Amino acid sequence: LRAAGPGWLFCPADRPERFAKAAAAADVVILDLEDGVAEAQKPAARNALRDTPLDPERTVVRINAGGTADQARDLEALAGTAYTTVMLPKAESAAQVIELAPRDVIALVETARGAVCAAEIAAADPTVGMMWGAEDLIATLGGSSSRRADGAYRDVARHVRSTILLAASAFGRLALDAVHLDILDVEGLQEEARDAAAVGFDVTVCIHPSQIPVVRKAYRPSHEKLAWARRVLAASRSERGAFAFEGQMVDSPVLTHAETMLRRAGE
Amino acid sequence: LRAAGPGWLFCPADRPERFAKAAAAADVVILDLEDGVAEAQKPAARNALRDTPLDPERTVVRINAGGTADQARDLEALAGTAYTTVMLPKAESAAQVIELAPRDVIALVETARGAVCAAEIAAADPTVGMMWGAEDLIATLGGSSSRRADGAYRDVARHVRSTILLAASAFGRLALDAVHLDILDVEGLQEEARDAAAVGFDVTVCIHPSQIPVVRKAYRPSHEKLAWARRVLAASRSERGAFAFEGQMVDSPVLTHAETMLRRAGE
Amino acid sequence: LRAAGPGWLFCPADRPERFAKAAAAADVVILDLEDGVAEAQKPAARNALRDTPLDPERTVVRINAGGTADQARDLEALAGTAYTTVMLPKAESAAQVIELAPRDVIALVETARGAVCAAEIAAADPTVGMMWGAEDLIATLGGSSSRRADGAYRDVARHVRSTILLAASAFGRLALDAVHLDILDVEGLQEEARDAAAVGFDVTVCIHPSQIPVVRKAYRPSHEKLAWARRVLAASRSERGAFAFEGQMVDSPVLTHAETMLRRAGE
Numbered sequence: 001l002r003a004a005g006p007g008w009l010f011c012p013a014d015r016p017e018r019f020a021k022a023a024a025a026a027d028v029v030i031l032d033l034e035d036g037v038a039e040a041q042k043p044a045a046r047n048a049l050r051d052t053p054l055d056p057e058r059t060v061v062r063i064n065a066g067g068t069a070d071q072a073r074d075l076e077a078l079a080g081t082a083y084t085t086v087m088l089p090k091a092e093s094a095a096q097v098i099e100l101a102p103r104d105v106i107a108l109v110e111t112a113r114g115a116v117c118a119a120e121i122a123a124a125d126p127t128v129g130m131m132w133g134a135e136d137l138i139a140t141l142g143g144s145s146s147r148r149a150d151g152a153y154r155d156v157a158r159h160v161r162s163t164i165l166l167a168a169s170a171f172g173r174l175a176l177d178a179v180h181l182d183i184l185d186v187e188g189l190q191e192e193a194r195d196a197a198a199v200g201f202d203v204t205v206c207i208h209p210s211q212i213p214v215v216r217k218a219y220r221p222s223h224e225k226l227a228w229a230r231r232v233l234a235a236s237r238s239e240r241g242a243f244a245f246e247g248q249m250v251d252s253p254v255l256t257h258a259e260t261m262l263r264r265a266g267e
Numbered sequence: 268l269r270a271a272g273p274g275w276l277f278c279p280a281d282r283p284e285r286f287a288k289a290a291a292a293a294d295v296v297i298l299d300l301e302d303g304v305a306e307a308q309k310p311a312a313r314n315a316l317r318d319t320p321l322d323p324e325r326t327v328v329r330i331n332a333g334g335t336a337d338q339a340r341d342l343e344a345l346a347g348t349a350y351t352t353v354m355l356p357k358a359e360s361a362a363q364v365i366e367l368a369p370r371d372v373i374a375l376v377e378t379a380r381g382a383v384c385a386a387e388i389a390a391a392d393p394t395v396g397m398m399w400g401a402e403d404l405i406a407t408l409g410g411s412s413s414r415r416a417d418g419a420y421r422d423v424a425r426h427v428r429s430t431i432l433l434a435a436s437a438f439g440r441l442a443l444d445a446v447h448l449d450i451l452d453v454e455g456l457q458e459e460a461r462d463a464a465a466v467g468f469d470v471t472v473c474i475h476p477s478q479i480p481v482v483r484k485a486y487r488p489s490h491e492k493l494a495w496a497r498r499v500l501a502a503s504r505s506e507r508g509a510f511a512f513e514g515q516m517v518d519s520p521v522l523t524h525a526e527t528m529l530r531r532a533g534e
Numbered sequence: 535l536r537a538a539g540p541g542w543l544f545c546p547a548d549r550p551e552r553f554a555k556a557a558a559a560a561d562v563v564i565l566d567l568e569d570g571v572a573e574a575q576k577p578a579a580r581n582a583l584r585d586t587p588l589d590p591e592r593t594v595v596r597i598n599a600g601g602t603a604d605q606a607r608d609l610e611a612l613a614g615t616a617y618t619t620v621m622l623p624k625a626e627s628a629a630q631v632i633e634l635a636p637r638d639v640i641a642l643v644e645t646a647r648g649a650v651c652a653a654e655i656a657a658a659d660p661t662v663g664m665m666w667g668a669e670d671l672i673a674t675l676g677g678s679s680s681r682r683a684d685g686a687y688r689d690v691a692r693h694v695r696s697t698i699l700l701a702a703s704a705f706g707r708l709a710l711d712a713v714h715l716d717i718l719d720v721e722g723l724q725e726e727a728r729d730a731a732a733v734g735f736d737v738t739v740c741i742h743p744s745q746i747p748v749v750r751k752a753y754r755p756s757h758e759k760l761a762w763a764r765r766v767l768a769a770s771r772s773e774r775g776a777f778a779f780e781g782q783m784v785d786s787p788v789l790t791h792a793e794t795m796l797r798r799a800g801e
């Protein structure tokens with residue numbers, strides 16, 4: 001999975017006619033049995049998932065939250081598939097992840113409790129990834145909007161995003177940035193995904209295939225950035241330790257950032 | 268307490284002549300025995316509490332910090348009243364809350380230690396709410412201003428606000444947003460309360476009855492938002508699952524934000 | 535160490551010809567054996583440490599990270615010196631600090647794990663201070679830049695900065711702000727230092743002697759803040775408890791901010 005591109009794509013499990021397209025456009029597809037599908041449509045979604053299989057090495061299935069009758073039906077259904085990685089919505093403790101063993105688990109922390117227990121969830125053995133959800137977050141806080149007038153996330157959402165990035169990285173898990181619900185707001189998605197790439201998120205999860213090209217381009221460093229990385233790496237080959245390059249103190253971790261941009265560009 | 272409006276108002280306990288005015292203007296009155304009252308005036312303040320009752324169902328009393336002789340004298344003064352809900356300043360541990368049993372406690376976290384321990388404080392059995400305080404926070408950090416030139420809270424205060432909001436919601440406690448000290452700054456207050464309302468705070472604490480109307484208004488969504496909520500919900504009942512509405516991916520938690528808007532207007 | 539001014543300065547240990555200049559420019563000097571010095575220059579740095587001593591009372595030595603052969607050689611080298619305070623890079627647990635007993639440790643938290651464990655690190659018995667580092671942080675997250683286009687730290691870094699400030703203050707440890715790598719960027723350094731001084735950081739670490747006067751300046755409150763502090767403290771000497779002053783509500787912690795402004799001026 002860590003070898004798949006950054007362009008991951010949700011597609012509702014009761015929409016099998018879209019599966020192959022989802023697979024085609026995206027790096028990894030998340031087949032959704034949760035919020036994407038109404039309760040009356042779950043069983044059909046579960047039949048589709050087993051009737052219309054995708055490459056299980058590039059497909060994750062978002063099941064329902066722990067302690068729900070739906071999750072048990074999902075697990076019963078997945079029994080009849082070859083999918084080994086699931087996403088857990090409303091992830092709220094290590095126990096919720098651990099009981100999914102031996103499947104690989106991407107924990108979607110999208111509640112206060114989850115936020116408070118982030119590191120615990122990250123540390124759990126089955127965890128291979130962490131994602132965060134702004135909208136469920138606010139909803140469970142009893143709020144009404146995740147962003148301010150100007151489109152930026154409200155503080156608590158920004159806070160949780162950092163918390164999840166830290167928890168995931170501190171335990172060597174993948175970090176996935178939140179979805180961008182404004183389908184046509186290409187510009188905002190781009191800015192969001194450039195920043196996500198810059199701080200070390202591994203994935204930006206998309207909800208529409210038109211988003212994928214934007215995310216992929218956004219995870220390629222700017223031309224001026226690659227130029228810089230090339231320059232500082234070259235200059236460092238004539239240096240021992242800390243030096244000044246173009247007005248700034250360079251040393252090990254900065255050289256590490258440069259290497260990372262060049263790796264991302266090659267990827 | 269969950270049943271009162273968002274407009275809470277401090278009034279120092281040594282000004283019994285303002286108690287009825289406060290009760291009249293506010294949803295809940297916080298009678299203050301701590302910072303609002305000089306040490307030399309505390310004993311008279313305590314006398315005021317016993318001599319000028321307010322409806323104990325709409326009235327909270329902020330006592331002094333744990334381990335202080337003042338707190339001991341507050342509790343014995345309080346033995347002569349019907350007040351069963353107290354606010355604990357400088358709340359720094361679960362033990363400080365638990366020791367106040369059997370009273371209900373709103374923890375005011377306004378120290379670094381408090382912030383480090385917020386989740387533990389919120390989980391404590393008597394806790395029914397959490398509030399944060401930016402000014403003691405900065406004071407205890409060794410700092411000198413909680414806000415930038417432009418009026419925004421400095422990063423650490425913004426950080427603690429979110430910490431407390433999450434700690435409270437994670438254990439189902441009321442969340443109270445900090446006081447706005449600039450009494451004539453109606454605009455700043457409104458901007459604060461509007462965002463507090465959006466992110467799930469239940470209350471904005473006020474320090475002047477002129478602020479209640481502002482907080483009450485801010486907690487009722489704008490016309491534009493209510494129109495949208497009506498719209499999204501209406502469409503939602505012809506919808507089954509995730510759909511697109513006005514360019515936005517909509518599902519479950521977005522629907523929940525809309526309900527919450529309408530609930531807040533209804534309230 | 536809490537008695538020296540806020541202008542701390544890094545100097546790599548491989549460059550002993552600058553030791554006295556740095557000791558002259560700065561309040562405290564951090565002699566560096568880690569990232570400022572290339573692996574092949576380490577042994578000479580160590581030689582230089584023992585052979586070119588500075589006032590141990592105004593010098594801290596940044597050694598290498600826990601569990602490395604380098605750190606072992608560092609301590610071995612320090613045995614022949616009078617330096618009793620060390621800076622610990624990549625601080626990731628209480629155990630890494632505790633093993634440095636009986637030396638005093640400034641923990642430099644600059645990884646996600648460190649951040650997740652900040653309070654644990656802060657509480658450890660040898661810790662006397664905390665510092666954070668944005669660039670190793672970003673590097674370990676798998677990111678490529680600590681700052682946005684406008685120079686502002688990205689969120690996760692801002693988030694980590696507050697974590698450290700809060701962790702260190704919760705256990706009474708010194709707090710040290712991150713270095714400013716853009717040597718020429720006086721204005722940004724000024725703006726960071728000013729804000730660091732406002733939220734209670736004790737120190738801004740510098741990486742070039744030309745930065746120290748900016749930092750010292752930044753930590754001295756502006757003439758306008760000082761006149762305010764004077765004004766408010768004077769008015770307060772005629773008041774009892776909370777009072778309105780120049781449109782703001784004033785009580786204890788506001789009065790404390792004023793005292794701290796005037797203390798920083800006198801210092």
Ligand SMILES: CC(C)(COP(=O)(O)OP(=O)(O)OC[C@H]1O[C@@H](n2cnc3c(N)ncnc32)[C@H](O)[C@@H]1OP(=O)(O)O)[C@@H](O)C(=O)NCCC(=O)NCCS
Pocket residue numbers: 010011012018019021022032035036179207208209509510511516517518
């Ligand atoms: C929101 C949504 C229902 C919009 O559907 P829509 O109205 O058909 O959107 P469009 O009209 O723009 O679709 C255009 C094309 O993109 C395809 N498409 C859109 N979203 C897709 C998706 N999530 N997966 C696969 N294909 C998708 C459509 O099939 C269509 O393809 P086609 O024209 O070649 O036949 C759909 O985008 C979707 O399901 N998004 C994700 C929902 C989800 O999983 N939420 C759960 C977690 S947030």
Ligand SMILES: CC(C)(COP(=O)(O)OP(=O)(O)OC[C@H]1O[C@@H](n2cnc3c(N)ncnc32)[C@H](O)[C@@H]1OP(=O)(O)O)[C@@H](O)C(=O)NCCC(=O)NCCS
Pocket residue numbers: 276277278279285286288289299302303446474475476776777778782783784785
């Ligand atoms: C700041 C403060 C001392 C100013 O008092 P002030 O100088 O009288 O200010 P104003 O002149 O504008 O007050 C006007 C009116 O509002 C009333 N008022 C102001 N603050 C009030 C309060 N907190 N509670 C009840 N009434 C209040 C006054 O009674 C006065 O009423 P009146 O005109 O009918 O006589 C006062 O607002 C106050 O005590 N606020 C709360 C402080 C506190 O509790 N701090 C501790 C925690 S933050």
Ligand SMILES: CC(C)(COP(=O)(O)OP(=O)(O)OC[C@H]1O[C@@H](n2cnc3c(N)ncnc32)[C@H](O)[C@@H]1OP(=O)(O)O)[C@@H](O)C(=O)NCCC(=O)NCCS
Pocket residue numbers: 242243244249250251543544545546552553555556566569570713741742743
């Ligand atoms: C980056 C660095 C090598 C720049 O070196 P430089 O190119 O010689 O810098 P300048 O040209 O601006 O030098 C200006 C003067 O200040 C001195 N100076 C610069 N940085 C200094 C430092 N960190 N300590 C002591 N003196 C320093 C120089 O020696 C020079 O003095 P001089 O004229 O008497 O010879 C130097 O700033 C440095 O080593 N900074 C700290 C690096 C470090 O320790 N990083 C680890 C943690 S971030």
Ligand SMILES: [Mg+2]
Pocket residue numbers: 035089110133135136520
């Ligand atoms: Mg969700």
Ligand SMILES: [Mg+2]
Pocket residue numbers: 302356377400402403787
């Ligand atoms: Mg206070």
Ligand SMILES: [Mg+2]
Pocket residue numbers: 253569623644667669670
């Ligand atoms: Mg570093």
